[PDB]
């Protein structure tokens, strides 16, 4: 695994020893090459895992997340090139350093054979994101947003640490392989109930769970474009990955303890999809859509059936790509209009036709149009839920209908109708933005050809 | 339908329920009780694989009709005779079904008449 970690570390001295006007080119080229190298982790086994060493191991759940993490950095650099133009070389190098450190921590987090090492890196990712949000955000609310994004996380994560060390004091190890092979049932006890809660709540808060989702709209709205991209694409999936790893020690207590979270997610997906219908801000609408999709992923993980896990993996990958694309489109509009109010700039199809095509395809993938991987994950989760209980179909279908409604509402409001007359600074789309949009969308339509790459270890 | 008016506006016990027909023994009327005759066997009627609801006592004419259509593919109009033979057999089948309906209706009439005559005799 060092053949990916070491180049990502070398990205830092290369960035800091670069010319003042070569940082973006060098960073983009070498991050793309690192993505290409990481692409060879996809050759997974039907047996246990790719156990590289005592410290790092790869799995067909970890490999798609690793590849998406490596692929996201070049897109983040391309998106950040525009709004950082008027800023000094040292500060741009610091921004690229924060992005590189975030990638390094995420890469080490997804392999992380140890649960304490996983926790340490899973919490180390917090610092670069907070600095990016509270340093290079625009509005005055960013500081407040950062505070939320901080404390919520720690409010969930501090009990987990205690639980973790407690387990190693009883089991003797926190290695995931030993934990899986030596797993034992949890008796229905108050102590075991609180151990279950301490294990679950940390990952629940970062999905986020419906009741615990307040930090996400603030953090995603006030963050710069690279921050929003990394928050929606990779950082939300840490909770799902952690739950998928940790639910192996929580059986059979998950059967009883899953009910409040299942109800919260099943009702909150409807609530947040309905919230999307009445939203005056593009970024907030995209954030609430992310909350709905992650609610579906929470349901899938809580059901803990093979089809549930496959659907959850597919949906995590598809949502990451789609939400990053949607945020990039919103930012392309914002850098022209500087308002971030959906109703202000209207009828952009007549002025930006190719960008309108990008908007249409992004809305189509968000709408879960078959045979996209978005719908593959959606349908697998829905079928698993139907087997779990036939009444889930009402909530699932209502969520599908509202999702289509708000996706097409977002498309029609911004692209169709009549152009706003007083806005005359809508310049033609740059090659950088179109390239960014294509680099988001072609991986999705190309992954629909080989779904088993993103269906997880239970395929 | 006229039968519906006599079963919905008149007496329900006067006329049959089409679901439960017949309600009387077959050989009740006359002791001959001839059997129905089937020409197509199991195997050929399976091999032609007509339809489950086409697998009735009219199957042989359908077999002939199907064969005629198949041989004369270009001249679709040529096999007029096969169609007539098949619809005539279906007409006979439908006439027999109507005869069963009328038969059971008359038997119901006679049974009601017998019971009312017996009741009159007993009360007298």
């Amino acid at each position: 695994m060092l053949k990916i970690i070491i180049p990502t570390t070398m990205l830092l001295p290369m960035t800091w020893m670069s010319k003042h006007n070569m940082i973006w080119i060098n960073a983009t080229v070498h991050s793309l090459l690192i993505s290409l190298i990481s692409l060879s982790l996809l050759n997974q086994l039907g047996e246990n895992s790719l156990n590289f060493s005592l410290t790092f191991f790869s799995d067909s759940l970890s490999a798609p997340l690793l590849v998406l993490t490596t692929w996201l950095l070049p897109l983040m650099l391309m998106a950040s090139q525009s709004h950082l133009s008027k800023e000094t070389t040292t500060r741009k190098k610091l921004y690229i350093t924060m992005l590189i450190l975030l990638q390094l921590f995420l890469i080490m987090t997804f392999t992380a054979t140890e649960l304490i090492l996983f926790y340490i890196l899973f919490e180390a990712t917090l610092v670069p994101t907070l600095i990016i949000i509270t340093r290079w955000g625009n509005q005055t609310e960013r500081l407040n947003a950062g505070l939320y994004f901080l404390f919520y996380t720690l409010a969930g994560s501090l009990p987990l640490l205690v639980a973790l060390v407690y387990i190693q004091n009883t089991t003797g190890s926190l290695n995931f392989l030993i934990i899986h092979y030596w797993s034992h049932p949890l008796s229905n006890s108050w102590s075991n109930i609180f151990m279950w809660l301490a294990c679950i709540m940390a990952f629940m808060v970062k999905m986020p769970l419906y009741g615990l989702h307040l930090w996400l709209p603030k953090a995603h709205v006030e963050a710069p474009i690279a921050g929003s991209m990394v928050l929606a694409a990779v950082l939300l999936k840490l909770g799902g990955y952690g739950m998928m790893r940790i639910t192996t020690i929580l059986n059979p207590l998950t059967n009883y303890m899953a009910y409040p979270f299942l109800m919260l997610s099943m009702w909150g997906m409807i609530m947040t999809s309905s919230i999307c219908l009445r939203q005056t801000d593009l970024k907030s609408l995209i954030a609430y859509s992310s909350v709905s999709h992650m609610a579906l992923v929470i349901v899938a993980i809580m059901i803990q059936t093979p089809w549930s896990f496959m659907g959850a993996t597919a949906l995590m990958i598809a949502h990451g790509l789609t939400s990053s694309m949607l945020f990039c489109l919103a930012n392309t509009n914002y850098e022209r209009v500087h308002s971030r109010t959906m109703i202000l700039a209207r009828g952009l199809q007549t002025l930006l036709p190719l960008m309108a095509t990008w908007w249409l395809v992004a809305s189509l993938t968000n709408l879960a149009l078959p045979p996209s991987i978005n719908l593959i994950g959606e349908l697998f989760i829905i079928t698993a839920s139907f087997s779990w209980s036939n009444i889930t179909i009402i909530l699932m279908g209502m969520n599908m209908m509202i999702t289509a409604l708000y996706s097409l509402y977002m498309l029609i409001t911004t692209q169709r109708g009549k152009y706003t007359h007083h806005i005359n600074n809508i310049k033609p789309s740059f090659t950088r933005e179109n390239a960014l949009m294509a680099l988001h969308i072609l991986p999705l339509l190309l992954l629909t050809l080989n779904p088993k790459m993103i269906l997880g270890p239970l395929y | 339908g006229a039968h519906l008016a006599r079963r919905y506006l008149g007496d329900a016990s006067k006329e049959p329920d089409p679901l439960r027909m017949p309600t009387f023994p077959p050989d009740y009327g006359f002791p001959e009780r001839k059997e129905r005759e089937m020409v197509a066997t199991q195997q050929e009627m399976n091999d032609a694989q007509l339809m489950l609801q086409q697998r009735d006592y009219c199957a042989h004419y359908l077999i002939q009709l199907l064969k005629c259509k198949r041989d004369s593919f270009p001249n679709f109009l040529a096999c007029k005779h096969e169609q007539h033979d098949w619809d005539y057999c279906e007409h006979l089948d439908y006439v027999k079904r109507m005869k069963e309906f009328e038969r059971e209706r008359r038997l119901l009439q006679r049974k009601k008449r017998r019971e009312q005559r017996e009741a009159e005799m007993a009360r007298g």
């Binding site: - | 009327g29 005539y88 005869k99 009328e102 038969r103 038997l107």
Partner: protein, 70 residues
């Protein structure tokens, strides 16, 4: 791809004889087809097999005994 027909402003529009002859031809073809089918195939509309009268069936063939035999 058509012919040049100028506006008219409150008279009957100009008509080519081609469209008139085609419309008349196709109307006549439709009526001829209807007549030809009716002549050759009248039973597709009127029916071929007479409907039996259930009240005309004798009590013998339906197995009815005069209320005392069985």
């Amino acid at each position: 791809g058509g012919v040049h027909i100028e506006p008219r402003y409150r008279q009957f529009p100009q008509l080519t004889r081609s469209q008139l002859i085609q419309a008349e031809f196709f109307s006549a073809t439709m009526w001829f087809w209807i007549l030809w089918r009716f002549w050759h195939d009248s039973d597709a509309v009127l029916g071929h097999f007479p409907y039996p009268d259930p009240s005309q069936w004798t009590d013998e063939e339906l197995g009815i005994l005069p209320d005392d035999e069985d």
